[PDB]
Design a protein around this ligand. Structure first.
Ligand code: P9Y
Ligand code: P9Y
Lengths: 325, 325
C-alpha cells in the first residue's frame, strides 16, 4: 500500500511537470517524451529507501498523535519524491565524473532534476504553511551534501585528514544529512510536528546511522566480490578516506604505514591486493564487528530518549534503523 | 558610485558565505581559502551587466515614485549578485562541456555557486516580505534557462527546427529570460513596485532586446575576427541554430541549401569558409542591418507604452537598451 501509493504519486508528479512544459513552456512533444524517458531512467530503479522513509514517518504521526489524513500522506509522497529526484540529480553528476552531445545532455539532465524538485514543491505545497520553511531546510541539506562532497573528494589533496573524526565529518555532511536526517524532517513537517521532537537527539540519531551504514559499505567495497556487491570496489584505487584506512593507520606499525602509503591510491591490481592483505593482517574485520555493535547500541539507546517526548516517532526510526541493520 | 557599491556588497556577501562555512559547516581554513579563490575566479571578471541592471532599476524607482532608500539599494546589490553568481554557475557547467580531480571540483563549483544564490537570498532577505515570491520567480527563470539550453543544444538532433520562430523560442528561454527580464523583475521586487508595471509589455520588451543582442552576437561569431571578438567563432562548426542560418535557408536557392547542408556543422576550416562565403553571397549582412533596425524601433515604441503607466521604469530600460545598442 505505501509503495503502491508512492508510484501513483509519481504519475501525478510526472504528469504535472511534463504538461507544464507542453502548455506553459512551449516544448515540442519530441522533447517531452525525451524528458519522460529521462525522468524514468534516473528517478526509477533504486529501492526508494530515502523516499519511502518520509511516508513511514507521516503515517506514524497521524495515527499516534479524517480529511486531514489524505492530505498529509499525499504531502509525504511529494516530499519523498523530492529526495528521490534530487538523489537522481547527484547520480547524474556522478556519471559526468566517470561538440559532444551525450555530455551536454547529461549536465542538462542534472539541472532539470534539481529544478523539478522546486517545481513540484512550489506546486503541491503552494497552499501549505510550510512551503517557505521546507524549501529553506531542503536547500541547506542540498548545500550540506555539496559541501560534504568537497570534504570527500579532497580528502587527499590540500593522509593528514585520515582521522576517525574527519571520517565522521565526511559521512555527516556527504551522506548522513541526506539519508538519515532529511527524510525524517520532511515527515515531521508534513505532519506539522516539527517543534514537538528533540532535534538534537534526532540529529544525533541521524549521524550514527550514517556512520553505521558508511562503515559497513566501506568493508563491502573492499571485501565483498563484485558479483555479490553489485559494483567494482574502487575505494582503494581512488585513495578514499574509508573506515578501513583510518582504522589501519591507527593500529599499524611504522612499516605497515609505509607499505600502506606506497600501495594506496594506485590502479595496480597487485598494489590493491597488497592493501587488502594489510587490512586482513591487521584483523580489521574483527574490529569492524565490535565497532558496528558499539554504534548499534548507541542507536537503540537514543531511540528511547526520543520516545519519552515522541512515542510515534521512534516506531518509524526503528523501522529506518531496521533497513540498515 | 553604483559599481563601487556593487563590489562592496560582494565583500559583504563573500564574508557571510565563507564565515558560515567556517562556523556552522565545520570547514577547515584550507578549503575556505580555496573557495574564496574559486568564488573570485568565477564571479568576478565580467562586465556585471546583469547585476548592475538591478541597481539601475532600483535607484530609478526610489527617486521617481530616507531610511527606506538604503535598504532597497542594498537589496538590489544582493539581487544583482544572485544573477552574477548564477551566471558563473552556468559558465562553470559550460567548461565541463568543453580519478580525475579537476573535473570533480568543476562539478562541485557549479553546485556551490547555485547553492550560494539561495544562501544569500535566505539571509539578506530573511525579513523581507518578498523572500517567498523572489525565490519562486528566481527558480522558474533558472528552470527556463535550463529548458532553453535544451532547445539550443538539441537544435539538430531529434534542419527542421531552423525557423525564425524557433530561433525566437531559443533566445527567449535560453537568453532573454535571464538577461533582459530577470534583472528588471528583481529591481521591481526590491522596490515593492511589481504589480505597478505592465508585465506583458515588460516581457515583450525583454524578448526583443534578447533577439537584438543574439542576432548581433551571431554575426560577430561568424564575421568578427577572433582577436577583435575575443573568442573563436564555432557556431558554424557546432551547427548552431543561428540567425545567419535561418535567414540563409529562407532566401537561398535549392542548390545553395544543398551546398549549405553538406558544409554546415563540420570542423573543416574549408567547409566553414564555404559557409561564410554563402552567407556573404546571399547579402545577409545587408538584411542584418535592416532586421536590427526593425527590432530597435519596436524597442523604442514599447518603452513609450510602459512609460504611460511607469515613468521611472522606462528611464532604466532606455539605459539597459543603450548597453546593447
Ligand atoms: Cl536535500 C538532498 C540532498 C542530497 C540528496 O542526495 C544525495 C546524493 C549524493 N550522492 C550519493 C551518491 N552519489 C552522490 C537528496 C536530497
Ligand atoms: Cl535566474 C538566472 C538564470 C540564468 C542565469 O544565467 C544564464 C547563463 C546561461 N549561460 C550563458 C552562457 N552560458 C550559459 C542567471 C540567473
Amino acid at each position: 500500500m505505501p509503495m503502491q501509493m508512492f508510484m501513483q504519486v509519481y504519475d501525478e508528479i510526472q504528469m504535472f511537470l511534463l504538461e507544464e512544459l507542453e502548455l506553459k513552456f512551449d516544448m515540442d512533444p519530441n522533447r517531452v517524451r525525451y524528458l519522460r524517458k529521462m525522468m524514468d531512467t534516473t528517478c526509477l530503479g533504486g529501492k526508494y529507501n530515502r523516499g519511502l522513509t518520509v511516508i513511514d514517518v507521516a503515517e506514524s504521526l497521524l495515527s499516534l498523535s479524517g480529511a486531514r489524513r489524505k492530505r498529509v500522506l499525499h504531502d509525504a509522497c511529494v516530499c519523498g519524491w523530492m529526495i528521490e529526484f534530487l538523489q537522481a540529480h547527484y547520480l547524474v553528476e556522478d556519471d559526468i565524473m566517470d561538440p559532444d552531445v551525450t555530455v551536454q545532455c547529461a549536465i542538462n539532465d542534472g539541472l532539470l532534476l534539481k529544478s523539478w524538485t522546486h517545481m513540484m514543491a512550489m506546486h503541491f505545497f503552494a497552499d501549505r504553511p510550510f512551503l517557505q520553511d521546507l524549501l529553506c531546510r531542503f536547500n541547506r541539506v542540498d548545500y550540506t551534501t555539496a559541501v560534504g562532497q568537497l570534504y570527500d573528494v579532497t580528502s587527499m589533496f590540500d593522509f593528514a585528514e585520515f582521522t576517525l573524526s574527519n571520517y565522521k565529518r565526511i559521512v555527516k555532511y556527504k551522506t548522513a544529512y541526506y539519508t538519515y536526517l532529511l527524510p525524517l524532517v520532511m515527515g515531521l513537517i508534513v505532519s506539522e510536528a516539527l517543534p514537538t521532537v528533540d532535534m538534537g537527539v534526532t540529529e544525533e540519531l541521524a549521524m550514527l546511522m550514517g556512520e553505521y551504514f558508511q562503515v559497513q559499505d566501506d568493508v563491502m567495497d573492499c571485501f565483498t566480490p563484485p558479483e555479490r556487491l553489485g559494483k567494482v570496489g574502487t575505494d582503494i584505487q581512488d585513495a578514499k578516506c574509508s573506515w578501513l584506512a583510518v582504522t589501519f593507520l591507527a593500529k599499524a606499525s611504522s612499516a605497515q604505514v609505509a607499505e600502506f602509503k606506497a600501495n594506496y591510491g594506485s590502479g595496480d591490481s597487485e598494489k590493491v591486493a597488497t592493501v587488502r592483505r594489510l587490512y586482513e593482517e591487521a584483523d580489521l574485520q574483527g574490529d569492524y564487528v565490535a565497532y558496528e555493535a558499539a554504534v548499534a547500541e548507541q542507536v537503540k539507546e537514543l531511540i528511547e530518549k526520543l520516545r519519552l517526548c515522541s512515542p510515534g516517532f521512534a516506531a518509524s526510526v526503528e523501522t529506518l534503523w531496521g533497513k540498515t541493520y
